[PDB]
Design a protein around this ligand. Sequence first.
Ligand SMILES: Nc1ncnc2c1ncn2[C@@H]1O[C@H](COP(=O)(O)O)[C@@H](O)[C@H]1O
Length: 547
Amino acid sequence: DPTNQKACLSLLEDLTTNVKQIQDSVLEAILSRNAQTEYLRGFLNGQVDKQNFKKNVPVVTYEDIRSYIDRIANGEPSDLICDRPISVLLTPKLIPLTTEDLEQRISFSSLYAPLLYKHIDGLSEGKSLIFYFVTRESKTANGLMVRTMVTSFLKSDSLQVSPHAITTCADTTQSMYCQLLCGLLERDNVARLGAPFASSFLKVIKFLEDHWPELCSNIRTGRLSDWITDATCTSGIGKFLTAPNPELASLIEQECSKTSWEAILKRLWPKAKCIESIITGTMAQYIPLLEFYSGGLPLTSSFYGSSECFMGVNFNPLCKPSDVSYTIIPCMGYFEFLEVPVVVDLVDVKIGHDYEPVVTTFSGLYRYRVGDVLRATGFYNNAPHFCFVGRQKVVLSIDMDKTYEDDLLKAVTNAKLLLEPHDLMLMDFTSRVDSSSFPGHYVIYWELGSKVKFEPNRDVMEECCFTVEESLDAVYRKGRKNDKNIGPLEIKVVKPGAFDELMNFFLSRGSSVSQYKTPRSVTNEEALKILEANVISEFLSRKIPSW
Ligand SMILES: Nc1ncnc2c1ncn2[C@@H]1O[C@H](COP(=O)(O)O)[C@@H](O)[C@H]1O
């Protein structure tokens, strides 16, 4: 929060030690400044203490305060919800952001950065090759900016391989190509690789897999592709491309031509010391693929965050992906936790319990529920750990059964092992409820790839079906064995890149390449048309689970 430079910052130690006191001061400030705002005044008539806050300010989801956002979106002053002015709305839910909040988030990334260098060796020797892409932005009925967390961040170079001109290119395909082409030219000075999310990084790699001949023609030739037409991208890359380089292009041609893409990330960027991308929550689905390309590079997730709030860091970057735990940053805002009618302070949180973060914010959110489940796993200093379980919203439900993101993540994780004996792997997956049969049943869509022209093994695929069911909750398995209101589960296999076509579908509906996440459930009849369109084979569970 205050004034840190870039010598040594033991603030990391103060923040994580005076947690109880730093949190009381954050709450004291929000209630004090915002005491005269329509939202906060209505519940507390100028009261500024925690005990009145916990009695009379309700714990809310996004629905409840949408009217306030819509009003500000529609030109009413920021004092409905926020003292300071509202700099942007972020993206279909729109979240108010204030400059001062934005700059606090960025300031924290700077102060956290010396911790990374101590923990992973040689991170300081070179620049990052981390892929961000901006999104087309809007403006309200009045002139309020509407943007993306990534886009908002980016509007603000020393340590990135890619010149700012290029990452800010309006066209994300051209920018990916060009960020790829700069990082190839500068492989010798790349000390890490990344993207915000594991899946976004894999998207880039796939791109490299399908566009590495043209990249390498461009390096030999020394002349750019004319698929890339934006002036910024073209001018911006002149500094990088310069003189023809046949030996490097041959050196790259050598790695991409091989029969396996195993360890390609180590072979292309031999000096990279880690891969930075989020591998928690749904993003654990992509660890097997990432590990396969990593060539033993460590996988590090460091940040847990949201439009609403910047919550926690991984103070243990080099750990098992299966053991990441994020430490709530006590000065980002006032954190409560709803066990899962009991809500609890950051300090009172009990280890091994599942909570949903409930935040109060410097940009107009009061006791706001984030929509995620966390499990308290311990303390970094005096500051609590949590591990990410999943989004807290049911993903599938035929009737009484409720399946959540995590227990479906587990059930697929368990099941996809039975694939791995024939060098086959589950690329991505999603689901829906089929109310068309009587009884209804679950449907999982599996896109298979391989580490190498293959066909699903029918006997294996029906044990994949069974293994999902067997991992689901007692209420499901009882529906199937006893109540007979749940039909045999079904896995549909989809053409490769079916999931990319699902993605592009949601991009043309306002989503962002950088912030995208594959839905583990799909109701949008929109997206079902695509999924069924890419279906090749279907299998059913032939055994009945047990309960
Ligand atoms: N480190 C992380 N691990 C798992 N999930 C995350 C992490 N950071 C962000 N997310 C998810 O991304 C959401 C942020 O929403 P958005 O504003 O669409 O990026 C969070 O509420 C989480 O569900």
